[PDB]
């Protein structure tokens, strides 16, 4: 299934460590389509705006609401 929040907030604070010893962010490696576009688009979010950590579980409980209503539909 799907990360909670907390379990995302810790895959893009990972991801933000790990990501320079790859060739990009697609080289990566994602156990899912899912973790790739979660991550990544939380990654620049936090970037391209000095997100706080409070700001980032906002975030990234909205991107896993709208990540699990495009599951559920198919």
Do not use: F
């Amino acid at each position: 299934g799907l990360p909670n929040v907390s379990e995302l907030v810790d895959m893009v604070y990972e991801y933000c460590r790990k990501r320079g010893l790859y060739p990009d962010a697609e080289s990566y490696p994602w156990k899912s389509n899912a973790h790739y576009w979660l991550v990544t688009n939380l990654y620049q979010n936090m970037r391209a705006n000095a997100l706080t950590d409070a700001e980032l579980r906002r975030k990234a409980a909205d991107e896993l609401v709208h990540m699990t209503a495009r599951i559920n539909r198919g």
